[PDB]
Structures are given as structure tokens and as C-alpha cells.
Amino acid sequence: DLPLDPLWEFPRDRLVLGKPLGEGAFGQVVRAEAFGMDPARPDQASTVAVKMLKDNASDKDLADLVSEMEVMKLIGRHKNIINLLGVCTQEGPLYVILECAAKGNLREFLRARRPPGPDLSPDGPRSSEGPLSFPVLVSCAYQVARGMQYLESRKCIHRDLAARNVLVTEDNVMKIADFGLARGVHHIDYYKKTSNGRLPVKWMAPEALFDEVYTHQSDVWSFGILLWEIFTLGGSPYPGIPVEELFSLLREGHRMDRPPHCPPELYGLMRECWHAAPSQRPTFKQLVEALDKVLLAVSE
Numbered sequence: 001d002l003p004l005d006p007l008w009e010f011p012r013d014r015l016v017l018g019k020p021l022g023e024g025a026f027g028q029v030v031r032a033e034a035f036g037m038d039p040a041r042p043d044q045a046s047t048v049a050v051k052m053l054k055d056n057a058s059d060k061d062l063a064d065l066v067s068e069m070e071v072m073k074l075i076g077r078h079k080n081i082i083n084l085l086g087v088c089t090q091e092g093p094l095y096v097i098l099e100c101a102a103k104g105n106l107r108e109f110l111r112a113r114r115p116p117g118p119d120l121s122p123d124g125p126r127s128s129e130g131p132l133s134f135p136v137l138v139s140c141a142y143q144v145a146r147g148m149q150y151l152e153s154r155k156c157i158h159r160d161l162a163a164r165n166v167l168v169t170e171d172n173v174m175k176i177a178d179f180g181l182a183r184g185v186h187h188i189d190y191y192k193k194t195s196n197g198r199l200p201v202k203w204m205a206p207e208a209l210f211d212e213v214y215t216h217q218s219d220v221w222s223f224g225i226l227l228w229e230i231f232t233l234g235g236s237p238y239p240g241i242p243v244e245e246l247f248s249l250l251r252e253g254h255r256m257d258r259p260p261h262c263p264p265e266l267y268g269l270m271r272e273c274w275h276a277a278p279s280q281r282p283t284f285k286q287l288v289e290a291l292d293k294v295l296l297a298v299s300e
């Protein structure tokens, strides 16, 4: 139906669909096995993620997915983003084949790895030692920053940067996902709560929420929120604050408190990302450099 792009096109018969992963405003994602994604070894099996329309797809849903597909083509490959592996556009439903990150999104990754609390009977030399350590958390923050720095250089604005939009591979590499998505910024239900209880409005920069203005600096604001998520080990921002109260507090210039067990360096970066003037927030390049110094200092 769509034009053939031999650069990206992949034989759909070389895909074996398996367990569904998730569902969005447009399109669903299904885990699938792929054979010969590397043309050099045609019979080699690899696990991929296939994005496709729902059973409810309108012509707008198709247009959004087609748009997402083209964005993925242009943006190129980077270690810290979900990369395009191929597409299926000929003689069958539209598939957008993405990279796999085995461990799911960063929020659930962190929440599932919170330290055992005080109610655990000590067993072994590492009773009080959890899966997560400070340098790894900084690494997570650093990688997202460098990934966003790449997206920015490709003139790509995410518009909903958050821990649930960052995917974690088998080797704990951060990969930013859903960055080229048409999110319908002119009709956002600011009170809409997701199925898992998320209020996406708590990630919006003031200029984006109030003036519908999106820049790379508005992403920097969101990265500040994402930083807060990381060092709360998957906490929800503005704890116990309903959207109505969020509106007024933001107009009053209210900001989140410094989370427990979070060094002043990183809460400093958070507050810098949350400066009212977008020009007074650090660039992603500066964020990468600032987080690098912290990471190198804690990596003997």
C-alpha cells in the first residue's frame, strides 16, 4: 500500500509474533522473534519489538504510526535510544520493528530494585545491600542525558521525557523510547491519569503546560523530573499533589523537595533544570558534562 523503501523493508514472514508488551494512544507493541535481521546471517534468531496499529485503527492512527516510522528513519543510530531495525509495509499490516530492552522501562526497573526494608531477617554478608548503588544511578542519569543530547542534535524534541519512557537493556544501558511521537499537544487532558496511575502533566515544563511551547529546554525541565524519579528509585513526582493543586503551586513557583539519600550535587542539577527561564536551565550538553564529573569521581 505504502511505497517500498528497500533500505528499511523487512520480510514480514521472517517475524514470529509473541507476547504483547504494551498499548498506547496509537499503536500497540508486540515482542517478536526475527530471523536474519542481520542479512549476513539469514537464519539467525533475534528478539525484537514490533509496533503495529490496533483493531480500532482510524486513518489518523495510521498517519501517526507512518509519521513515527519516518522519524525513526531520519534520527539514525545511537547507543542510548531505541533504534529502528526495520519496517513491514508491503502486502500486510504496517509494522515498525524496534530494538529490544529486556528489563522494561526505567521506572519499573528502579521500583523492583528498592533495598530490602527493616523487616527482613538478616541472611548472608549482604543483608542490607540492595541491587542499586549510587554510581549506577548516576550512570542511568548520565546515559539518558547523552541520549537526549543526541536527540537534540537531530532537532528532535521528546515532549514527554520520563522514567517510563526510558527503557533498560540486559546490560543496564538506558534507551530513550517514544521520542518521535505525535502526542496531540493541543488537546491534552491535564487531569487524565494513566492505567498505572501516572499523571503526565507533572513532567511538563511551565511554558509547555501554560503556553503550549516546546523547546529542547522544555525537555531539560522534564529531565529534571526524571532525575528526581531516579534518586527516589521510581517515585512519583509531587507526592500526593492533585493536578488542580499542581496548577497553583507551579504558578507560585513551587518546586519539589530534596529527596532522602540524595546528594546536594544532584538536587542542585534538578533545581537547575527547574529554573523558570528556559535559558537559565542547563543544556543537555552541560548536563552530560556535569553528570560525567560526578560519575568519574565515584568510579575508582
Ligand SMILES: CCC(=O)Nc1cc(N2CCC(N3CCOCC3)CC2)cc(F)c1Nc1n[nH]c2ccc(O[C@H](C)c3c(Cl)cncc3Cl)cc12
Pocket (backbone or CB within 6 Å): 021, 022, 023, 024, 029, 031, 047, 048, 049, 082, 098, 099, 100, 101, 102, 103, 104, 105, 164, 165, 166, 167, 177, 178
Ligand atoms: C523486546 C524485549 C522486551 O520484551 N522488552 C520489554 C518488555 C516489557 N515488558 C512489559 C511488562 C511485562 N510484565 C510481565 C509480567 O507482569 C508485569 C509486566 C512484560 C515485560 C516492557 C518493555 F518496555 C520492554 N522493552 C522494550 N523493548 N523494546 C521496546 C519497544 C517498545 C516498547 O513499548 C512499550 C509499550 C513500553 C512498555 Cl511495555 C513499557 N514502558 C514503555 C514502553 Cl515504550 C517497549 C520495549
